[PDB]
């Protein structure tokens, strides 16, 4: 039918790896930016490498890829990653703890901890 070939796929992956700055969603902007960078021969391999590149960034808008790895993730992934909440999830009011744990704590010099609730195994 119409399946993409090893050279074309490899070229597309390389372009994505080195130039995610310059691409887009729109197909024809991917196509004039490939003649400028890479020393490709002419159209029918210049047009099958710019066409698997538009395909491969919509799938980035489905999340991650299993083929590329460039420390960037646009300007949204980073934002989502270096996120932090208002108060830390470890700053808790009352922490539920076992008797054994309490005993251990006691035999560690930490008998004077205040935040603990020793819940019994009922």
């Amino acid at each position: 039918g119409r399946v993409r070939t090893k050279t074309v796929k490899k070229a597309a992956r390389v372009i994505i790896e080195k130039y995610y700055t310059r691409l887009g969603n729109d197909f024809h902007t991917n196509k004039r930016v490939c003649e400028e960078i890479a020393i490709i021969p002419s159209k029918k391999l210049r047009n099958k490498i710019a066409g698997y590149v538009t395909h491969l960034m919509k799938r980035i808008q489905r999340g991650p890829v299993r083929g590329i790895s460039i420390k960037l993730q646009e300007e949204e992934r980073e934002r989502r990653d270096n996120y932090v909440p208002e108060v830390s999830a470890l700053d808790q009011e009352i922490i539920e703890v076992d008797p054994d744990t309490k005993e251990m704590l006691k035999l560690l010099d930490f008998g004077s901890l205040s935040n603990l609730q020793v819940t019994q195994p009922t």
């Binding site: 050279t7 070229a11 390389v14 372009i15 080195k18 960078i37 890479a38 020393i39 021969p41 391999l45």
Partner: protein, 65 residues
């Protein structure tokens, strides 16, 4: 690329008992011709020029020139 990379040469040495043809097909390299090689590469090979690394911007800088 079989027409401008490989170069076939068929001759006949004449030894005593029969004949021995020879077929020496030499695929030529790239590097456009400083006497050597065809200009245009293989239409399969794609080379990707390393990006000239631009400035990551710090401050909106106006420098009048």
């Amino acid at each position: 690329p079989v027409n401008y990379y490989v170069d076939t040469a068929v001759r006949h040495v004449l030894l005593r008992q029969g004949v021995l043809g020879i077929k020496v097909k030499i695929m030529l390299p790239w590097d456009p011709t400083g006497k050597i090689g065809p200009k245009k590469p293989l239409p399969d090979h794609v080379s990707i020029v390393e990006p000239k690394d631009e400035i990551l911007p710090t401050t909106p800088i106006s420098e009048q020139k």
